Amino acid sequence: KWTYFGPDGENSWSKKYPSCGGLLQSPIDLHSDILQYDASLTPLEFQGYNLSANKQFLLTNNGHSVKLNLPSDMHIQGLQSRYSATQLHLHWGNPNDPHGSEHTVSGQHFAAELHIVHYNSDLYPDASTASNKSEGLAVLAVLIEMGSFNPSYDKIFSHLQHVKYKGQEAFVPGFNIEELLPERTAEYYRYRGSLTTPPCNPTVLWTVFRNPVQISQEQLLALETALYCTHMDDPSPREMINNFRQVQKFDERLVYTSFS
Amino acid sequence: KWTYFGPDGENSWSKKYPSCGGLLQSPIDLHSDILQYDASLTPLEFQGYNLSANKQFLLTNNGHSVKLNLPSDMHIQGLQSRYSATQLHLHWGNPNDPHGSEHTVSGQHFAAELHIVHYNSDLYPDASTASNKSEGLAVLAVLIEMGSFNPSYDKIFSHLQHVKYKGQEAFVPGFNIEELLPERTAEYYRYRGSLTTPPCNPTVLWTVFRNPVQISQEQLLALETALYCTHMDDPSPREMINNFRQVQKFDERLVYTSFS
Ligand SMILES: CCCCNC(=O)c1cc(S(N)(=O)=O)c(Cl)cc1SCCc1ccccc1
Ligand SMILES: CCCCNC(=O)c1cc(S(N)(=O)=O)c(Cl)cc1SCCc1ccccc1
Ligand SMILES: [Zn+2]
Ligand SMILES: [Zn+2]
Numbered sequence: 001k002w003t004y005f006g007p008d009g010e011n012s013w014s015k016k017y018p019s020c021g022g023l024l025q026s027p028i029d030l031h032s033d034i035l036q037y038d039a040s041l042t043p044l045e046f047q048g049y050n051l052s053a054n055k056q057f058l059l060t061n062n063g064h065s066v067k068l069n070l071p072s073d074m075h076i077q078g079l080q081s082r083y084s085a086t087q088l089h090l091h092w093g094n095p096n097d098p099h100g101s102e103h104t105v106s107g108q109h110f111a112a113e114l115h116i117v118h119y120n121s122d123l124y125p126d127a128s129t130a131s132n133k134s135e136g137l138a139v140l141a142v143l144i145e146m147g148s149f150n151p152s153y154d155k156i157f158s159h160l161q162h163v164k165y166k167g168q169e170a171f172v173p174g175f176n177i178e179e180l181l182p183e184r185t186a187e188y189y190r191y192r193g194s195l196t197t198p199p200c201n202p203t204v205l206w207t208v209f210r211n212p213v214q215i216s217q218e219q220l221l222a223l224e225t226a227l228y229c230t231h232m233d234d235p236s237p238r239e240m241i242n243n244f245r246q247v248q249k250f251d252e253r254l255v256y257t258s259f260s
Numbered sequence: 261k262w263t264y265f266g267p268d269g270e271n272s273w274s275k276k277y278p279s280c281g282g283l284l285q286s287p288i289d290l291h292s293d294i295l296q297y298d299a300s301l302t303p304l305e306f307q308g309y310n311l312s313a314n315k316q317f318l319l320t321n322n323g324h325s326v327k328l329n330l331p332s333d334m335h336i337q338g339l340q341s342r343y344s345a346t347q348l349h350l351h352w353g354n355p356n357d358p359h360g361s362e363h364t365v366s367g368q369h370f371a372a373e374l375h376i377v378h379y380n381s382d383l384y385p386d387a388s389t390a391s392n393k394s395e396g397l398a399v400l401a402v403l404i405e406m407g408s409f410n411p412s413y414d415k416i417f418s419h420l421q422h423v424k425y426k427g428q429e430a431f432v433p434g435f436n437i438e439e440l441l442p443e444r445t446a447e448y449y450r451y452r453g454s455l456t457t458p459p460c461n462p463t464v465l466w467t468v469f470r471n472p473v474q475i476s477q478e479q480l481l482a483l484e485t486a487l488y489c490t491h492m493d494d495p496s497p498r499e500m501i502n503n504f505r506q507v508q509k510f511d512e513r514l515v516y517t518s519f520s
Pocket of ligand 1: 062089115117137139196197199
């Protein structure tokens, strides 16, 4: 058990989850001095992203974020192994401070952040088994900026009202998960890092897209007001807000870019 | 034992230093939405900061920073108690990434940060005894950027050669310590926080001057490269770099400004 605020917050994670106080932690601040162009970084292909709108996918409040379960037929080609999808989820701030991206760019938070989590299906049978193992995970990160209404993101946000409390679950119709990605997915940052949550294992190949996507003010307000970290019956209910980790020391890492 | 790197890093400080996971942690990002002008914040007076050049003061490498011992006769006038000087020390980054201030303005790191540590000499005999007590400590924080050669900061940096390693000590003719302060010291940020180092006690009244000082690219490089955090005959030397804490979450609070 852990939170983003007070005694159980991120400065205390390492007391229960030692990897949280180890090396190669995420997120990080993307800034010119630590960037390095790499000709190796070829375009990813997103296979099986186009989920049938006549099929149903489990959305869950896990007490930390809202998660959408993804089928393992969904995958990434282009890395050293096949990375199969396990779930996507978000990180955001609060109505009075809508700047809850995990990754920052030249010291600036975006409004929110989407993480599409994949596991090494060539090595491991699921994300859970893969999470504490070498080369176990790969995440696509989309930075989210406040702008126009996003009908694609709304295929998640219109469902939040059925997963208000921890452990609540709701079937959501499939849609093309590629619609959540920004323009020019060929332009990305790539670095070796960790889960941004406990148990913080340094097993994550990070891809952060260069370009953000936009969702409206009304979409962020809904995301920032709809969810609780706590069970429906908890007498000390806590709002699910500011569910982002502070950026971490580089530990001599560089971030490789597909662009110069 | 505590460091800015590896398993004994800042995410692990809370294990042996509980306060590092507690309330009112420094440093923080100073940005517009958390600033509030308070017309009641008048100028500090720096008394006995003009040290005899015929008096000598101990410079030490403690393996966390380089520290100049200061005489208690020097103090700040303007607060509700007299705060007497104990030491000044610095925080910096590394030559590939020369952005190692502790406090940030609008998410931006300055090259470095000087701290002049004072203690409540009306209530407490010493900084050690004051450190974990109400209204114990007051720091003057100076943000340092690349710029023109600074003769006054060179009165310190000219002696780094003699304190290369953990343990080494050296003497510095006195100079006017007010010479290390920027222009318009009437302009400052003010907030209650913590030591940025273990034991992280929430006992510090922070005064961060609005205006940075400038040191030359060569002065900054000397600081970043002159010192080690290991003993002169450690087999495995460690360069003393990136000796700054990551900014902390600053939830539902204000930094007050002396400036509109
Ligand atoms: C186990 C509950 C903690 C909540 N975190 C995640 O679901 C999560 C977050 C990330 S992140 N924010 O770095 O993108 C990642 Cl990369 C993976 C997971 S969960 C999948 C791995 C796992 C499964 C089961 C137990 C432990 C880990
Ligand atoms: C034994 C302490 C280890 C190193 N830290 C400092 O000297 C230090 C740093 C700051 S900061 N970076 O917040 O300006 C401050 Cl406010 C005070 C001290 S040391 C003075 C207080 C103290 C002395 C002895 C034991 C504990 C605290
Ligand atoms: Zn995440
Ligand atoms: Zn300091």
